[PDB]
Design a protein around this ligand. Structure first.
Ligand SMILES: Nc1ncnc2c1ncn2[C@@H]1O[C@H](CSCC[C@H](N)C(=O)O)[C@@H](O)[C@H]1O
Ligand SMILES: NC(=O)c1ncn([C@@H]2O[C@H](COP(=O)(O)O)[C@@H](O)[C@H]2O)n1
Length: 262
């Protein structure tokens, strides 16, 4: 029921080569080369396990999401979001959960700052476990599909999932894979009405996804928000100068935290 649908078809209609070029046109990138080589080498200090750490950092260093207390990371994969939160000031406990298993990102043990406050377990399907009480809820789940109706389903599953974990003034950051499909817009509107927050586009996301994140400390008419991104993604189809701007990767430190305010 929208304009992002025009974008998706155009996207799908791209040639393999055209596609790769577009996917990174004028986006923001994280310089991960050395971080990956160090990880591959067994290093467990400083490195982010994925570009997700840098991704979360962007929202956090802007107070769009303020992870505190018990943080639950739904679909932590390797744990970029979890290890990152494990080094943040007022965070006490970090629990990350994923499916893992062959053909899936499995959590990677690390000794980055606060790693001791972080527990990651795979072999978990978040959709069928009971909700635990938590102060901040993070969720980065959402598999992309060439078929926008398939994505719309996946998106809703996630929204319903999180609604079940959100309480009082729970802090949250949740990926909304396909925010432009009308059932997803409809649900988002309900949620926003019920828990506030807004949808925000992360400059680090690639042009090949219309993904937006529902963050707790931000507002803005949903529909308006998605169209903005839709127009933007379309504008980017036709670009002179398609370079990606890079930035150093995040450094996650290497110690253990003792907690206890003091
Ligand atoms: N039902 C489910 N239960 C648990 N994990 C799931 C799931 N469906 C998908 N996932 C997982 O969710 C992950 C999302 S990608 C993880 C990104 C992470 N924030 C990064 O920074 O490291 C995938 O690795 C996938 O295996
Ligand atoms: N035109 C192509 O050659 C091509 N390849 C992938 N895509 C679009 O982008 C989406 C996911 O992006 P990616 O495959 O992980 O980069 C797909 O689901 C599809 O809609 N398009």
């Amino acid at each position: 029921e929208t304009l992002g649908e025009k974008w998706k078809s155009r996207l799908n209609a791209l040639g393999k080569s055209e596609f790769q070029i577009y996917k990174k046109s004028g986006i923001q990138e994280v310089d991960r080369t050395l971080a990956k080589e160090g990880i591959k080498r067994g290093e467990t200090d400083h490195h982010a396990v994925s570009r997700g750490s840098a991704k979360l950092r962007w929202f956090v260093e802007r107070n769009l999401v303020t992870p505190e207390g018990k943080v639950v990371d739904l679909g932590c994969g390797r744990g970029g979001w979890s290890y990152y939160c494990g080094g943040l000031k007022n965070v006490r406990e970090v629990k990350g959960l994923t499916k893992g298993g062959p053909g899936h990102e499995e959590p990677i043990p690390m000794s980055t700052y606060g790693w001791n406050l972080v527990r990651l377990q795979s072999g978990v399907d978040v959709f069928f476990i009971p909700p635990e009480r938590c102060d901040t809820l993070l969720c980065d789940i959402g598999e992309s599909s060439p078929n926008p109706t398939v994505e719309a389903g996946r998106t809703l599953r996630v929204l319903n999932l999180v609604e079940n974990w959100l309480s009082n003034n729970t802090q949250f950051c949740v990926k909304v894979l396909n925010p432009y499909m009308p059932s997803v817009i409809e649900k988002m509107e309900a949620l926003q009405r019920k828990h506030g927050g807004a949808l925000v586009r992360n400059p680090l996301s690639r042009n090949s996804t219309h993904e937006m994140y529902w963050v707790s400390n931000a507002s803005g008419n949903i529909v308006s928000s998605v169209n903005m991104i839709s127009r933007m993604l379309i504008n980017r189809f036709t670009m002179r100068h398609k370079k990606a701007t890079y930035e150093p990767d995040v450094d996650l430190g290497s110690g253990t935290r003792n907690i206890g305010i003091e």
